[PDB]
Amino acid sequence: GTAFFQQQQLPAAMADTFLEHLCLLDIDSEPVAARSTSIIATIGPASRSVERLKEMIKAGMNIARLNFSHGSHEYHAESIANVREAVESFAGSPLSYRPVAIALDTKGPGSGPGLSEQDVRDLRFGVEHGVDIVFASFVRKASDVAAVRAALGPEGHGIKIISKIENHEGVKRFDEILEVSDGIMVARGDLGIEIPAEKVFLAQKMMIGRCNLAGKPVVCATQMLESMITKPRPTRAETSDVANAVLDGADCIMLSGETAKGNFPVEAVKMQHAIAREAEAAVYHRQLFEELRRAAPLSRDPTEVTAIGAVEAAFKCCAAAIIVLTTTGRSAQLLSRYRPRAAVIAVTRSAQAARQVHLCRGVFPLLYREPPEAIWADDVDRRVQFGIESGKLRGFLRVGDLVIVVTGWRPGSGYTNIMRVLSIS
Amino acid sequence: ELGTAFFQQQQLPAAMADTFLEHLCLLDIDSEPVAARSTSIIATIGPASRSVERLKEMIKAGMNIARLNFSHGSHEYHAESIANVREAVESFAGSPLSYRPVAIALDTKGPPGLSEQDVRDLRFGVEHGVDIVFASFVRKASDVAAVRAALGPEGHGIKIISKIENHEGVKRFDEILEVSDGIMVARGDLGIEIPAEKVFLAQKMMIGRCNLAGKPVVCATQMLESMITKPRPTRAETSDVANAVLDGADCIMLSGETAKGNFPVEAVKMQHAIAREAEAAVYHRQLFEELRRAAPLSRDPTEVTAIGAVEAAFKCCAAAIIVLTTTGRSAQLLSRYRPRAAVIAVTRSAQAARQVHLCRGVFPLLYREPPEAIWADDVDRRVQFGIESGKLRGFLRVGDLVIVVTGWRPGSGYTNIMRVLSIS
Amino acid sequence: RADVAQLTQELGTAFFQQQQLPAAMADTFLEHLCLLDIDSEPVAARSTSIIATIGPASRSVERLKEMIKAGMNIARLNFSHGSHEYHAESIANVREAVESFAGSPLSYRPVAIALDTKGPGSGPGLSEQDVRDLRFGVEHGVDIVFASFVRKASDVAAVRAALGPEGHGIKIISKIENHEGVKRFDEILEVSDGIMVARGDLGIEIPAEKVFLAQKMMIGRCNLAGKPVVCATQMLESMITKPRPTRAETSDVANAVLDGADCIMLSGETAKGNFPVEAVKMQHAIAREAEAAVYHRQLFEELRRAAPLSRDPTEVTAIGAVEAAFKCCAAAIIVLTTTGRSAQLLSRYRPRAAVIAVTRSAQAARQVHLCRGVFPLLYREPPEAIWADDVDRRVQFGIESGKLRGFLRVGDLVIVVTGWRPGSGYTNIMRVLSIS
Amino acid sequence: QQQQLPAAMADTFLEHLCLLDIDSEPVAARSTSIIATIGPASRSVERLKEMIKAGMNIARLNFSHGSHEYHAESIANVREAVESFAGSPLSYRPVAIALDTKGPGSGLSEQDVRDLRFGVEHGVDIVFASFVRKASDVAAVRAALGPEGHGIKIISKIENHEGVKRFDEILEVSDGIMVARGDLGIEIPAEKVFLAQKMMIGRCNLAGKPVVCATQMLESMITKPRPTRAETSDVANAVLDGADCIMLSGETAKGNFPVEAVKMQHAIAREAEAAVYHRQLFEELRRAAPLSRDPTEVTAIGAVEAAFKCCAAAIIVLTTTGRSAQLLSRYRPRAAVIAVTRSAQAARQVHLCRGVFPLLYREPPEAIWADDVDRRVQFGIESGKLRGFLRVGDLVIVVTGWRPGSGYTNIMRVLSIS
Ligand SMILES: Nc1c(S(=O)(=O)O)cc2c(c1O)C(=O)c1ccccc1C2=O
Ligand SMILES: Nc1c(S(=O)(=O)O)cc2c(c1O)C(=O)c1ccccc1C2=O
Ligand SMILES: O=P(O)(O)OC[C@H]1O[C@](O)(COP(=O)(O)O)[C@@H](O)[C@@H]1O
Ligand SMILES: O=P(O)(O)OC[C@H]1O[C@](O)(COP(=O)(O)O)[C@@H](O)[C@@H]1O
Ligand SMILES: O=P(O)(O)OC[C@H]1O[C@](O)(COP(=O)(O)O)[C@@H](O)[C@@H]1O
Ligand SMILES: O=P(O)(O)OC[C@H]1O[C@](O)(COP(=O)(O)O)[C@@H](O)[C@@H]1O
Ligand SMILES: O=C([O-])C(=O)[O-]
Ligand SMILES: O=C([O-])C(=O)[O-]
Ligand SMILES: O=C([O-])C(=O)[O-]
Ligand SMILES: O=C([O-])C(=O)[O-]
Ligand SMILES: [K+]
Ligand SMILES: [K+]
Ligand SMILES: [K+]
Ligand SMILES: [K+]
Ligand SMILES: [Mg+2]
Ligand SMILES: [Mg+2]
Numbered sequence A: 001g002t003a004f005f006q007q008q009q010l011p012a013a014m015a016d017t018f019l020e021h022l023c024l025l026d027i028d029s030e031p032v033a034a035r036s037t038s039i040i041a042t043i044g045p046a047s048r049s050v051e052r053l054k055e056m057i058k059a060g061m062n063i064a065r066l067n068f069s070h071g072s073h074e075y076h077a078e079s080i081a082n083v084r085e086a087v088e089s090f091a092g093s094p095l096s097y098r099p100v101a102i103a104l105d106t107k108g109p110g111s112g113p114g115l116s117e118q119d120v121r122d123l124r125f126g127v128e129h130g131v132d133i134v135f136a137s138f139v140r141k142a143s144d145v146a147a148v149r150a151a152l153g154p155e156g157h158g159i160k161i162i163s164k165i166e167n168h169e170g171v172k173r174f175d176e177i178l179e180v181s182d183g184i185m186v187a188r189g190d191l192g193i194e195i196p197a198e199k200v201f202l203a204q205k206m207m208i209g210r211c212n213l214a215g216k217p218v219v220c221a222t223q224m225l226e227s228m229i230t231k232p233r234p235t236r237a238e239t240s241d242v243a244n245a246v247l248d249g250a251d252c253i254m255l256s257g258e259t260a261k262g263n264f265p266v267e268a269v270k271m272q273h274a275i276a277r278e279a280e281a282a283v284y285h286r287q288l289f290e291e292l293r294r295a296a297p298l299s300r301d302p303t304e305v306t307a308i309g310a311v312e313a314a315f316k317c318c319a320a321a322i323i324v325l326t327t328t329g330r331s332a333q334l335l336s337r338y339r340p341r342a343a344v345i346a347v348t349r350s351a352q353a354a355r356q357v358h359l360c361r362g363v364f365p366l367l368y369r370e371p372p373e374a375i376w377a378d379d380v381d382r383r384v385q386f387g388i389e390s391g392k393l394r395g396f397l398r399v400g401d402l403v404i405v406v407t408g409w410r411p412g413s414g415y416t417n418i419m420r421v422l423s424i425s
Numbered sequence B: 001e002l003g004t005a006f007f008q009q010q011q012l013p014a015a016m017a018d019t020f021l022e023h024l025c026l027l028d029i030d031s032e033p034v035a036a037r038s039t040s041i042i043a044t045i046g047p048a049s050r051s052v053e054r055l056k057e058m059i060k061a062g063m064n065i066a067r068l069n070f071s072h073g074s075h076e077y078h079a080e081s082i083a084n085v086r087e088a089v090e091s092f093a094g095s096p097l098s099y100r101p102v103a104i105a106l107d108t109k110g111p112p113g114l115s116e117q118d119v120r121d122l123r124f125g126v127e128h129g130v131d132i133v134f135a136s137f138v139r140k141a142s143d144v145a146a147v148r149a150a151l152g153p154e155g156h157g158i159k160i161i162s163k164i165e166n167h168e169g170v171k172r173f174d175e176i177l178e179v180s181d182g183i184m185v186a187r188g189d190l191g192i193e194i195p196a197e198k199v200f201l202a203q204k205m206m207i208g209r210c211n212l213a214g215k216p217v218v219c220a221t222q223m224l225e226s227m228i229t230k231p232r233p234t235r236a237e238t239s240d241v242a243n244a245v246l247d248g249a250d251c252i253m254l255s256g257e258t259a260k261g262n263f264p265v266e267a268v269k270m271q272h273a274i275a276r277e278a279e280a281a282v283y284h285r286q287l288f289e290e291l292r293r294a295a296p297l298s299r300d301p302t303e304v305t306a307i308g309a310v311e312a313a314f315k316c317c318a319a320a321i322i323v324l325t326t327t328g329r330s331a332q333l334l335s336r337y338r339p340r341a342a343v344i345a346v347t348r349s350a351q352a353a354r355q356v357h358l359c360r361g362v363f364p365l366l367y368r369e370p371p372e373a374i375w376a377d378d379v380d381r382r383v384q385f386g387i388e389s390g391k392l393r394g395f396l397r398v399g400d401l402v403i404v405v406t407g408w409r410p411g412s413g414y415t416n417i418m419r420v421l422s423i424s
Numbered sequence C: 001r002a003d004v005a006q007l008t009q010e011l012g013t014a015f016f017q018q019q020q021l022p023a024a025m026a027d028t029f030l031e032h033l034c035l036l037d038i039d040s041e042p043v044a045a046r047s048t049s050i051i052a053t054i055g056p057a058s059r060s061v062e063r064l065k066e067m068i069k070a071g072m073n074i075a076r077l078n079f080s081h082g083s084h085e086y087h088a089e090s091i092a093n094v095r096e097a098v099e100s101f102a103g104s105p106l107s108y109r110p111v112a113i114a115l116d117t118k119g120p121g122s123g124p125g126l127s128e129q130d131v132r133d134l135r136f137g138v139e140h141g142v143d144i145v146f147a148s149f150v151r152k153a154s155d156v157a158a159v160r161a162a163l164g165p166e167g168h169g170i171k172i173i174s175k176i177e178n179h180e181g182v183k184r185f186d187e188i189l190e191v192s193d194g195i196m197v198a199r200g201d202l203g204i205e206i207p208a209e210k211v212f213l214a215q216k217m218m219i220g221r222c223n224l225a226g227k228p229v230v231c232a233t234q235m236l237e238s239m240i241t242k243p244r245p246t247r248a249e250t251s252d253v254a255n256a257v258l259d260g261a262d263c264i265m266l267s268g269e270t271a272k273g274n275f276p277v278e279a280v281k282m283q284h285a286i287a288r289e290a291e292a293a294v295y296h297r298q299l300f301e302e303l304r305r306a307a308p309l310s311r312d313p314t315e316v317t318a319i320g321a322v323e324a325a326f327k328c329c330a331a332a333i334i335v336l337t338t339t340g341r342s343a344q345l346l347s348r349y350r351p352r353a354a355v356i357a358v359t360r361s362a363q364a365a366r367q368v369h370l371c372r373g374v375f376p377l378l379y380r381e382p383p384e385a386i387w388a389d390d391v392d393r394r395v396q397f398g399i400e401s402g403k404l405r406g407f408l409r410v411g412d413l414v415i416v417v418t419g420w421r422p423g424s425g426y427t428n429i430m431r432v433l434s435i436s
Numbered sequence D: 001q002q003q004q005l006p007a008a009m010a011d012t013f014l015e016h017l018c019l020l021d022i023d024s025e026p027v028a029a030r031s032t033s034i035i036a037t038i039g040p041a042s043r044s045v046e047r048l049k050e051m052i053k054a055g056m057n058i059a060r061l062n063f064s065h066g067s068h069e070y071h072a073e074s075i076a077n078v079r080e081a082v083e084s085f086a087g088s089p090l091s092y093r094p095v096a097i098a099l100d101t102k103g104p105g106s107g108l109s110e111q112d113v114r115d116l117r118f119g120v121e122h123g124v125d126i127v128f129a130s131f132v133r134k135a136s137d138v139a140a141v142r143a144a145l146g147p148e149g150h151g152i153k154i155i156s157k158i159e160n161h162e163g164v165k166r167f168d169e170i171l172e173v174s175d176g177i178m179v180a181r182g183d184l185g186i187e188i189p190a191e192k193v194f195l196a197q198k199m200m201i202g203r204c205n206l207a208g209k210p211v212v213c214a215t216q217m218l219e220s221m222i223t224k225p226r227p228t229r230a231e232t233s234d235v236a237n238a239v240l241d242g243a244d245c246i247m248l249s250g251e252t253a254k255g256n257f258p259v260e261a262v263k264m265q266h267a268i269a270r271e272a273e274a275a276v277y278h279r280q281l282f283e284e285l286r287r288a289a290p291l292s293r294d295p296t297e298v299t300a301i302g303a304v305e306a307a308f309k310c311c312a313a314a315i316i317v318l319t320t321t322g323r324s325a326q327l328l329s330r331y332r333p334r335a336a337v338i339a340v341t342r343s344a345q346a347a348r349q350v351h352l353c354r355g356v357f358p359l360l361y362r363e364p365p366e367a368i369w370a371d372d373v374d375r376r377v378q379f380g381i382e383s384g385k386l387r388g389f390l391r392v393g394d395l396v397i398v399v400t401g402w403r404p405g406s407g408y409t410n411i412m413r414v415l416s417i418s
């Protein structure tokens, strides 16, 4: 239909140049797709009430951040329990249940060179309480990431380490840090004090670009909607900053004081949600996909090979979604690195992977709870049908849509190799 | 890894260039072609190439399609030539490393409508089971419809390749291509009907439009003309063959060179050698991107699977794309995106195996095994047949990655699956 | 590597590490972002003009001199506040601070005066207060009018009519502040001299989360049209009370420049805030960093591809001069202009080289601040007897001022743009000159 | 529209090919120079006048055949036919004389030393040096031309594997290259010659140096009045590849249709030049060309950019050595490069550069240098109007210098005709 091609900035998406793409942006072209940039909300006095956390989950919060710079272990354990109670209050309806990751933001090394003793204790607290992510403060070199990894012990092997770049050394040693990290956070607060304030945008745009190239998650953080701590609406610079972080290529956007201590935690989440949807439709996918494809090296890994085939197939038919079965989240992450316009619906039995895939843009995790079928092929199909039924319920899919389905040839992680074109019935 | 030697062969340094100009500068005469020759060779069978023994040598040299020119000879003469082609083709039906399907194409004499002789010759083609018709002097869409009507109740599966030989056919090209299975740039008559210095424009335009439409295009006439009397061609002749391949031609043709000349086998060998060199020199980076950008969005799962499979093949430098096809359509749709990987088409149809030679880079395998009771097993047996033939022919080695294209249920029109397999 | 090797041996590796030059030679926009370096220092003069609102915090002659030194190019007078007497006093103070540096072209900095109208309130047509304020502007010789709440082409015709016969030279920058203005944008831009993305009212008239789409669309269309575009409101809002801005604020300023804005504006930051000079200095520092981070390779190619073929010799000379400037990394393009038009046409192709515009018109010297990368040099000398010698004196004046201000260095290449006959509209010559 | 303008505005090379129209007639003058070998079939003064009218720009004398006396007679006949049109200076066409050496066979041969000395004594403009295989071979040819031999342009013939492999070092010291396909097709596999041709043409286009495509281009025309389909295709593809010159050997030296072979190359080259995809070509030439601090190089790119912006009918350039015209030519403008020169040798040698139309200025010098320049520019305009290049209302780009003498080009002006 003609109405379909007027929505989600589709006239601007078919432009032959970036300049004509900008000229074709339409304030009346309403976003159609689900919001793909994850929202991280920092927990605190303003957002710990189980009833308030349910409202923030409904507003769009995907990751709950625990700032270990404030509060005791007892306070953070209560935070975790309240988060989990609000999240599990929706588990009764599996087709609409939203997983929410728990991220521990460390205090940092302070005037020291290595892992502080408080960080060692907080990291072990995280492992004991099953946190999904660590936002490691003031990472300056690859050895800092190794020390965080060592402090998590043998039972914290699955925890994702997102390195916070907050100073000149972190920016200069970026490549070595990214190589050993699961992802990066552009921690603009400290970075804006450590380097000239007028240079932060260069560091942000560089790090987002390099993470997009590496296929690793990147978070844009601090003062995104700062004025919303006290005011019900943000400034023009604030909405622009959120939209530009999304247009830059950020996988996640973050709220600090806006959700931890402010008077508008639910409204700050709703504002980030509304801006991110508008900004994602305004992404010039033609140039982005082409540049991601050209820059990505050749690969002999069947997961990586299937992912680019599926993203290409998804673009060819305007697929509403790419449904992928995943154990660790990796197959969904490899689909995500090519920035498809189609939503990546990731079906998994791992509650931890379902939480952690929120770090990857455009990945919508679905927690599958059923015990395995006796016939593996039937078990794979029930999970694909679960993705279709959830997608229909959530508005991602309709009858007649085309979907790309990504599976593997055998059980277990690391064997994704099949891409199938499916029509929604 | 694949090794430094791997990335110096088949013009791979020139393939990674960021501009077409840089790509030309990086072409290396020492960079040897490794992939199998993907542009099919059509050889005209006449007095100089009719014998069963000569035909076996032409098949070994690379002939994929045998052309019978109905402007010369009689029905009896061409029936004997067809029988000799089939005898030479079936002489290799043992050793699978030598058995190659060979299509039979009937080139009509030409025309106020369809000529009485054309109606009789087209009827002869149906009775003798020809695979293709090269229809002479097609000027408009109604000319194709007349040839289509003459292919009668039994020959609707025969491919009609319209020969564009005059100003009217060039001007009415879009309407002709829409109703034809493919096109032949018949340069001989075209060079007399329009100024000789304009033929290259017509050739480049028609090849481009056929590539865009995803339909086969043949470059024909005087490609190696001097080889009718001389054992080696001129510098202009080898250049013409290489440039037809670089232009985007699916097939290249030999007329008098193989029908009446003194070096028919040498002419086939020469076209084979040039085509291999020219295919490695194709700038796939720009070609694939432009084919992709110009091709409209599709909701046909075969077309969607094909672009996914070609993208996947480039990503891992796949040795081949193995496709299961009954009519040849799934292989044709893979072929339109010009993959560097060979498209191994496994089929139970002898006709589809011969006809897919019209599509660049499609290597047909005719499968004769009895069907398995379980369809999923029958599919795996043909996929393994393609891998084993590929290993035997030199396309594949253990540890290689291949892309496998199949459908979700039996029958034609359901291709929707692309799998990345590691060769064991 | 080979398309920079000889110039790298000549100019040195240090030259090619500054002003984001490694990021500028990238083959993709993605590679360009990856190559951005916080240690790559900006070298070029700041090309995006700063508009500062003059009010209670920035009215004094002494404060205004500090603001001019900090980088203020255009003084905005908001006719929504104050009286005619109040704004006349502000204009006189701006002119006194500006003329305190008139002693030498090396210290002179021309500053435009812009009148921002109150608007039509609930009225469809021009308000009676606007008619009086517009006549005040003509009587006080303002250079620009920022016309509030423009909704259609007839609104700009009404503003033009209210300026009378003596306000023909005044530039009209239409403020787009509502849904109707955005929808009728093309018809408004066609009759306006430029546009202002008035985000404050626009953010109330349309959903706040859609303002960035309107800003990016309008900046793109103005860049395509070759007309000035201003990004305005809340750019450094927190600097009204704090000495440093938020991370969102510096990002917003950098992104307005990266979007293609010719001017950036400060409102309460300079009108009523505690850090007016610091707000101007902050916009100057961010704009210099953001201009070096512009991906000129894609920008110039896209401006070329989108611009139609032209038979106007000024337009033809401008693209030839911008192409020549990029080829040799020219330090500047010196252009002779009467109305500012030849400098504007150079400016639409976004050269990295500074456009030094030599003019005798004091008004054109002030108004060219609306065009990104145009540095106005007012020529005060009496005309020579021979026209060709007058032109050469003006060109040498640009070179000597450029050397003294640091734009030009010995060994640099400059591109010189002149005409064949006197008078406006005859630019047709481009010359490559080596600085000795 | 004419001259493949619908195909020229295409956004992709594929769509450009699809838009090629056999009814879109070429309008611009033929840019690719034709080199014709002068021999028994083309030696007469009367035959040479018809070859000049057919389009011959450079006369090649093959020193593998004939004697010094024979070639001197051929040179005299070429000069007599060329000067028969000098009465009308606005339409006179200069013709270069090129000496093709015999070669080294089994250093520089003693016969080559004598033939090169003959060339200097007879004022040849170009040397096509046979079997160049390294930079030292070019230096030997340069030495054999003596102190009174720097004026002659050395075009190195690449005819074997070593020449192809050491191409970059040969191109660096040569004025240009000839893809000598005859010997190259015997020295390397015949099916690889197209790779060597396309690589060498690309590298010469990148270097901004002339490249000639030679041998068997219209071979069948030695005995037949019309060429084969492969032959016309080969000529068109050499032009589409980026060749500055195309050559006729036996077709003009010993064949039954020498004038027809020249006419055929002229007709094909005009069609192929209009089918060049300038959008991609200019962008790639610009991107690949290095940054430069030379004002001639800087003015050249500015002028070519300005010409495309207004669809300029021509770029009129004043040149002493031909260098300013060569630097304009390397950017492949669609606009004709009309090179107004006082040097007769420069007017002949500039035929090696695609799209350069040489004009010999034979009017008296004006008193004011500034006045003298304007008359050389008006000369270009009057010749252009007479030859069909220009019409009243057209836009031209004029490339002049700031001071007399070679090496000072730095000015580009946009001028409206009449
Ligand atoms: N040139 C010719 C070609 S063609 O250009 O390759 O089409 C084909 C043929 C002949 C040609 O002369 C014959 O003489 C001939 C005689 C008797 C039976 C059959 C043929 C024949 O097929
Ligand atoms: N923010 C303000 C702005 S604006 O937002 O930058 O336009 C402008 C002004 C004021 C602001 O506070 C005043 O208080 C003011 C008082 C008395 C006379 C004139 C002004 C004035 O022009
Ligand atoms: O993204 P991961 O962790 O590699 O998971 C992909 C795996 O998921 C599957 O699709 C389903 O496997 P399971 O039945 O073990 O969940 C496998 O075939 C595939 O290897
Ligand atoms: O190219 P075609 O003619 O559509 O053939 C493709 C068909 O081949 C298959 O892959 C295998 O089908 P069969 O088992 O019937 O041969 C089908 O699933 C698919 O529809
Ligand atoms: O940019 P404008 O307004 O068209 O002015 C450019 C004009 O300036 C000049 O360079 C010099 O003109 P004047 O002698 O009138 O100052 C003209 O040749 C040219 O037409
Ligand atoms: O093309 P070349 O060899 O560099 O020389 C072109 C020369 O032509 C001029 O425009 C005019 O020079 P002349 O007075 O010597 O004819 C010079 O200014 C310029 O240096
Ligand atoms: O730690 C952070 O979030 C910061 O410094 O911005
Ligand atoms: O019929 C043909 O093949 C021709 O005319 O070239
Ligand atoms: O008028 C203004 O400046 C605004 O609305 O932002
Ligand atoms: O010498 C030549 O010209 C050749 O061999 O092609
Ligand atoms: K912290
Ligand atoms: K025939
Ligand atoms: K106002
Ligand atoms: K010779
Ligand atoms: Mg911090
Ligand atoms: Mg014919």
Ligand SMILES: [Mg+2]
Pocket (backbone or CB within 6 Å): C148, C177, C198, C200, C201
């Ligand atoms: Mg307003």
Ligand SMILES: [Mg+2]
Pocket (backbone or CB within 6 Å): D130, D159, D180, D182, D183
């Ligand atoms: Mg030779």
